[PDB]
Design a protein around this ligand. Structure first.
Ligand SMILES: NS(=O)(=O)CCNC(=O)/C(Cc1ccc(O)c(Br)c1)=N/O
Ligand SMILES: NS(=O)(=O)CCNC(=O)/C(Cc1ccc(O)c(Br)c1)=N/O
Ligand SMILES: NS(=O)(=O)CCNC(=O)/C(Cc1ccc(O)c(Br)c1)=N/O
Ligand SMILES: [Zn+2]
Length: 259
């Protein structure tokens, strides 16, 4: 069974032994070199249609916490930009650091943000998530960087439930949460073809990384850092530094939606 994590003994440098696609040709995350990305005037505007989103539950899975959505119909979808067709929101989660100077998975001119939010969507032409992850255009992940500054009010409901899911395997109801409150003002983005950033590291993702970070407060990110990787009644290991570092770009181009 799955024994991957973020520690010295089971972290990103070990993943390749069970998941050899870790050394593949379209791995994520990557550094976004802002002076090598090309503005692509053909990209359409991005369409984030989250008005009918139905959040269900929040779960600590021992790697991060996921907010799960009802993806049984086109309720919260991503379209446009580099995408063909319609991608359904299934879950969001974050990656974060032990300190404010690290935590993001993508970097921008080698800059690491405190955290990174991933909104994971799957291509409806493949009918379910499991089938989608087997296709090179199966997922669209919207990535949003977090910096520490002013509080993000649309994050606070998430921060306030984290005490109820401290350890691995704990879940809680999380209905009526509006993921629109996690977005920045601008939808300017970079895009590139890549992979899941966790095992099984499948090369099925169109990445859409927003240029504008959102600001969260030090108190809000502190609460992320109080979570635990371990299960109840096990030795406490704080859930921090659950990020994969940047991977080789290889033969890929990162495109910008903006000049
Ligand atoms: N290539 S990988 O999937 O990242 C990591 C594979 N390594 C392992 O299974 C182990 C032994 C291990 C044993 C029991 C556990 O409960 C955990 Br956790 C890990 N490393 O010490
Ligand atoms: N950081 S991320 O790129 O957004 C990747 C977030 N990780 C994932 O969704 C998973 C869970 C997963 C669940 C069911 C599956 O069939 C497959 Br495959 C993966 N990795 O195991
Ligand atoms: N050698 S591989 O292709 O990476 C094995 C591929 N495994 C799968 O698609 C899965 C889904 C999965 C879910 C969560 C995980 O954490 C991992 Br890992 C894998 N089996 O459950
Ligand atoms: Zn992620």
């Amino acid at each position: 069974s799955h024994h991957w994590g973020y520690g010295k003994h089971n972290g990103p440098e070990h993943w390749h032994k069970d998941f050899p696609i870790a050394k593949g040709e379209r791995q994520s995350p990557v550094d976004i070199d802002t002076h090598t990305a090309k503005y692509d005037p053909s990209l359409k505007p991005l369409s984030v249609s989250y008005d009918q989103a139905t959040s269900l539950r929040i779960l600590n899975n021992g790697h991060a916490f996921n907010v799960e959505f009802d993806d049984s119909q086109d309720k919260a979808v991503l379209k446009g930009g580099p995408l063909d067709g319609t991608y359904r929101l299934i879950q969001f989660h974050f990656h974060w650091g032990s300190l404010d100077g690290q935590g993001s998975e993508h970097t921008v001119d080698k800059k690491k943000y405190a955290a990174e939010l991933h909104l994971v969507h799957w291509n409806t032409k493949y009918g379910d998530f499991g089938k989608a992850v087997q296709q090179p255009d199966g997922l669209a992940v919207l990535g949003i960087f977090l910096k520490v500054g002013s509080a993000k009010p649309g994050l606070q409901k998430v921060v306030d439930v984290l005490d109820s899911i401290k350890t691995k395997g704990k879940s809680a109801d999380f209905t009526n949460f509006d993921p629109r409150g996690l977005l920045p003002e601008s939808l300017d983005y970079w895009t590139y073809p890549g992979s899941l950033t966790t095992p099984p590291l499948l090369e099925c993702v169109t990445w859409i990384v927003l240029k504008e970070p959102i600001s969260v407060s030090s108190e809000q990110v502190l609460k992320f850092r109080k979570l635990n990787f371990n299960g109840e009644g096990e030795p406490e290991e704080l859930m921090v530094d659950n990020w994969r570092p940047a991977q080789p770009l290889k033969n890929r181009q990162i495109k910008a939606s903006f000049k």
